[PDB]
Design an enzyme around this catalytic site. Structure first.
Site, PDB file in Angstrom:
ATOM      1  N   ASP A 140    -134.996 -95.025 -59.318  1.00 50.05           N
ATOM      2  CA  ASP A 140    -135.770 -93.980 -58.660  1.00 50.05           C
ATOM      3  C   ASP A 140    -136.580 -93.169 -59.659  1.00 50.05           C
ATOM      4  O   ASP A 140    -136.585 -91.941 -59.606  1.00 50.05           O
ATOM      5  CB  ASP A 140    -134.866 -93.041 -57.867  1.00 50.05           C
ATOM      6  CG  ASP A 140    -135.595 -92.345 -56.713  1.00 50.05           C
ATOM      7  OD1 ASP A 140    -136.697 -92.783 -56.287  1.00 50.05           O
ATOM      8  OD2 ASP A 140    -135.035 -91.343 -56.227  1.00 50.05           O
ATOM      9  N   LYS A 142    -139.710 -91.429 -60.938  1.00 48.58           N
ATOM     10  CA  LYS A 142    -140.868 -90.793 -60.349  1.00 48.58           C
ATOM     11  C   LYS A 142    -141.016 -89.412 -61.028  1.00 48.58           C
ATOM     12  O   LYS A 142    -140.079 -88.950 -61.662  1.00 48.58           O
ATOM     13  CB  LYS A 142    -140.678 -90.615 -58.836  1.00 48.58           C
ATOM     14  CG  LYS A 142    -139.388 -89.951 -58.391  1.00 48.58           C
ATOM     15  CD  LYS A 142    -139.340 -89.984 -56.853  1.00 48.58           C
ATOM     16  CE  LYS A 142    -138.166 -89.182 -56.294  1.00 48.58           C
ATOM     17  NZ  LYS A 142    -138.189 -89.265 -54.799  1.00 48.58           N
ATOM     18  N   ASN A 145    -138.346 -86.752 -60.809  1.00 54.12           N
ATOM     19  CA  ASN A 145    -137.103 -87.007 -61.528  1.00 54.12           C
ATOM     20  C   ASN A 145    -137.286 -87.006 -63.052  1.00 54.12           C
ATOM     21  O   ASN A 145    -136.511 -87.624 -63.739  1.00 54.12           O
ATOM     22  CB  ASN A 145    -136.468 -88.321 -61.049  1.00 54.12           C
ATOM     23  CG  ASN A 145    -135.860 -88.197 -59.656  1.00 54.12           C
ATOM     24  OD1 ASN A 145    -135.553 -87.094 -59.210  1.00 54.12           O
ATOM     25  ND2 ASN A 145    -135.701 -89.315 -58.962  1.00 54.12           N
ATOM     26  N   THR A 180    -138.433 -94.950 -53.821  1.00 57.54           N
ATOM     27  CA  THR A 180    -139.373 -94.009 -53.219  1.00 57.54           C
ATOM     28  C   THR A 180    -140.677 -94.770 -53.048  1.00 57.54           C
ATOM     29  O   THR A 180    -141.089 -95.504 -53.948  1.00 57.54           O
ATOM     30  CB  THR A 180    -139.562 -92.769 -54.139  1.00 57.54           C
ATOM     31  OG1 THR A 180    -138.313 -92.081 -54.234  1.00 57.54           O
ATOM     32  CG2 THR A 180    -140.631 -91.796 -53.600  1.00 57.54           C
TER      33      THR A 180
END
Ligand code: ANP
Ligand code: CA
Ligand code: CA
Ligand code: CA
Ligand code: CA
Length: 472
Positions: A140, A142, A145, A180
């Protein structure tokens, strides 16, 4: 008996409120769920995520995440200090990063210059090269994060939120459709994939940094996923000023067929990443001399002392306290993967000698190699063949500076699990995560440390052990 920073994470028997005092809330999430707290003993500030058991299989997933954070030590990966559980809650006690999400930098400027983007993506790739080498995939990545360590324009990046992360194996492919929409790799949507999925997500981030816009876009999640699945993208007006080298790296990270997609390691080695600056980190002779001096004096440390020093160095020192050491680490880490290897330490010694104007031919041909072999063994706390960031800081730090009154007290209470006031061989066993410590190991602690001959180590003896009958 391999020592790692992760062994201290769940080791305290104390309750959260006996170790931390809440100050203000932190972040832009649901109110009060992340709190800036102060360590009651050391004064160290930290970010605590408080998870109510009303809000979490979910318990299993939280624990898996804690287990993954316990296995990672890297300058670009979030540090987890501790994890507490009580009847009502879980508490995730983390290193605090105050520069906000990269997402917010993105939405407050048109786009990043190539040099600013390369600095960011270089750090992400260092993090994931290291992760992948340790058989962990993030899944994840992105800008939400990726947190900046502070508001300083030169703040480093930390990868956070390992809630979707897992171990991966060469033999069995991953299957869960997880991620995502803007960032997810097409093969994840098709449902058979490996760690190259993180490289793709990083390519998406890079594309956004340089243009301001996602490469696969649409009115809603469904439309975005349809573009993602086809994999077609274009460099369509801002792209006219972007270098061919930057585009080449993006082409390689967004390569549709995963077997042909660049690895994190090779992307870290890409010319764009490698040559975006020629600026050198400033490290003066005295700081490097002192660090090397400290590291080479570490051989012969017994197991209680070793674990205690690693605790203090890896859990109880701030970024501000370790500025000088961190610079030395990055300077020595030639291949920028955030771990020091044998070849890198060798070069570090030769560098020091050159800096001091020492004649290297005055030593045997393999004098440096012999030195590094001894030093490396001694300072490699988990014996995995590398010097990780926290191992390095622990050993290279000025000893008197590390051993503050508060750090000594914190470390003693962490080892003394039953609060008896003495550390037993069995408390030594439990911190190292084993059933029993052998007689020779404990005897070698006692022969140096047990000044009143009672077979256990009290706070006085523990301080003297680390400090000449020193006591603070
Ligand atoms: N180590 C940290 N230091 C400082 N702030 C943090 C840290 N970790 C998370 N935050 C911030 O606290 C807020 C919520 O964190 P977190 O609980 O990770 O959010 P979430 O539940 O994953 N969803 P969201 O909060 O929208 O990202 C966010 O603004 C984060 O940026
Ligand atoms: Ca390295
Ligand atoms: Ca190591
Ligand atoms: Ca005890
Ligand atoms: Ca004793």
């Amino acid at each position: 008996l391999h020592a790692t920073p992760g062994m201290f994470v769940q080791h305290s028997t104390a309750i959260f409120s006996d170790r931390y005092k809440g100050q203000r809330v932190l972040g832009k999430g649901s109110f009060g769920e992340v709190i800036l707290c102060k360590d009651k003993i050391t004064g160290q500030e930290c970010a605590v995520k408080v998870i109510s058991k009303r809000q979490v299989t979910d318990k299993e997933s939280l624990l898996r995440e804690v287990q993954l954070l316990k296995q990672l030590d890297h300058p670009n990966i979030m540090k987890l200090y501790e994890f507490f559980e009580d009847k009502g809650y879980f508490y995730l006690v983390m290193e605090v990063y105050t520069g906000g999400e990269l997402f917010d930098e993105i939405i407050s400027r048109k786009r990043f210059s190539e040099v600013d983007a390369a600095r960011i993506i270089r750090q992400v790739l260092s993090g994931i090269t290291y992760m992948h080498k340790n058989k962990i995939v993030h899944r994840d990545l992105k800008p939400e994060n990726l947190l900046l360590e502070s508001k300083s324009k030169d703040a480093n990046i930390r990868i956070i939120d390992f809630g979707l992360s897992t171990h991966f194996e060469a033999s069995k492919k991953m299957k869960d459709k997880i991620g995502t929409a803007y960032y997810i790799a097409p093969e994840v949507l098709h449902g058979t994939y490996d760690e190259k999925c993180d490289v793709w997500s990083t390519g998406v981030i890079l594309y956004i940094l340089l243009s301001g816009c996602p490469p696969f876009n649409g009115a809603n999640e469904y439309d975005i996923l349809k573009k993602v699945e086809k994999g077609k993208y274009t460099f369509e007006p801002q792209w006219k000023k972007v270098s061919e080298s930057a585009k080449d790296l993006i082409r390689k990270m967004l390569t549709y067929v995963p077997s042909m997609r660049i690895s994190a390691r090779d992307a870290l080695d890409h010319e764009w990443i490698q040559t975006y600056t020629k600026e050198q980190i400033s490290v003066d002779v005295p700081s490097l001399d002192n660090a090397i001096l400290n590291i080479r004096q570490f051989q012969g440390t017994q197991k209680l002392a070793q674990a205690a020093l690693l605790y203090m160095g890896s859990k109880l020192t701030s970024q501000d306290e370790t500025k000088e050491l961190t610079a030395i680490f990055h300077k020595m880490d030639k291949n920028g993967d955030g771990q020091l290897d044998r070849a890198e330490l060798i070069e570090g010694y030769k560098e020091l000698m050159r800096m001091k104007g020492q004649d290297a031919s005055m030593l045997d041909a393999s004098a440096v190699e012999h030195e590094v072999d001894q030093v490396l063994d001694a300072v490699d706390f988990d014996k995995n063949g590398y010097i990780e960031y926290s191992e390095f800081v622990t050993v290279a730090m000025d000893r008197k500076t590390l051993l503050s009154r508060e750090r000594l007290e914190r470390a003693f209470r962490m080892f003394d699990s039953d609060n008896s006031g003495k550390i037993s061989s069995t408390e030594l066993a439990t911190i190292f995560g084993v059933s029993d410590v052998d007689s020779e190991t404990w005897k070698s602690v006692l022969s140096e440390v047990d000044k009143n001959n009672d077979g256990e180590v009290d706070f006085d003896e523990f301080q003297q052990m680390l400090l000449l009958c020193g006591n603070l």
